């Protein structure tokens, strides 16, 4: 039964591949440093 | 960063409040020039009368 063994192995390979795809660590490294560079200042009527 | 951005906006509002005193400074700058020109003529008139004397 090579066909059934091949299908299980390929289905396993797909299932391992999907598990690897979500295996990660999300990070939030976007602080408010750019907000400190948006100092809106009024033009003075010289 | 949010606290700093608040304080920066506070300074921006205060600079808008000081725009009025800049306008008064411009008004006094015009009045100072008109005084210095008119009073020098008053000094020049007095010097011309002294020159005639």
UniProtKB/Swiss-Prot annotation, chain A:
Task: Tell me one GO biological process term.
Answer: proton transmembrane transport
Domain of life according to the entry = Eukaryota
Does the record's keyword annotation contain Cell cycle? no
Main localization is mitochondrion
**GO cellular component terms?**
mitochondrial membrane; proton-transporting ATP synthase complex
Query: Where is the protein found, in the record's own terms?
Result: Mitochondrion membrane
Q: How does it sit in the membrane?
A: Single-pass membrane protein
Chain ranges passing through the membrane: 3-23
Question: What keywords is this UniProt entry annotated with?
Answer: ATP synthesis, CF(0), Hydrogen ion transport, Ion transport, Membrane, Mitochondrion, Transmembrane, Transmembrane helix, Transport
Entry coiled-coil feature ranges: none
Query: Quaternary arrangement and interactors, per the entry?
Result: F-type ATPases have 2 components, CF(1) - the catalytic core - and CF(0) - the membrane proton channel.
Functionally, this protein is described as follows: Mitochondrial membrane ATP synthase (F(1)F(0) ATP synthase or Complex V) produces ATP from ADP in the presence of a proton gradient across the membrane which is generated by electron transport complexes of the respiratory chain. F-type ATPases consist of two structural domains, F(1) - containing the extramembraneous catalytic core and F(0) - containing the membrane proton channel, linked together by a central stalk and a peripheral stalk. During catalysis, ATP synthesis in the catalytic domain of F(1) is coupled via a rotary mechanism of the central stalk subunits to proton translocation.
Q: Which family does it belong to?
A: Belongs to the ATPase protein 8 family.
This chain belongs to the protein called: ATP synthase protein 8
User: Origin organism of this chain?
Assistant: Artemia franciscana
Q: What are the leading ranks of the lineage?
A: Eukaryota, Metazoa, Ecdysozoa, Arthropoda, Crustacea
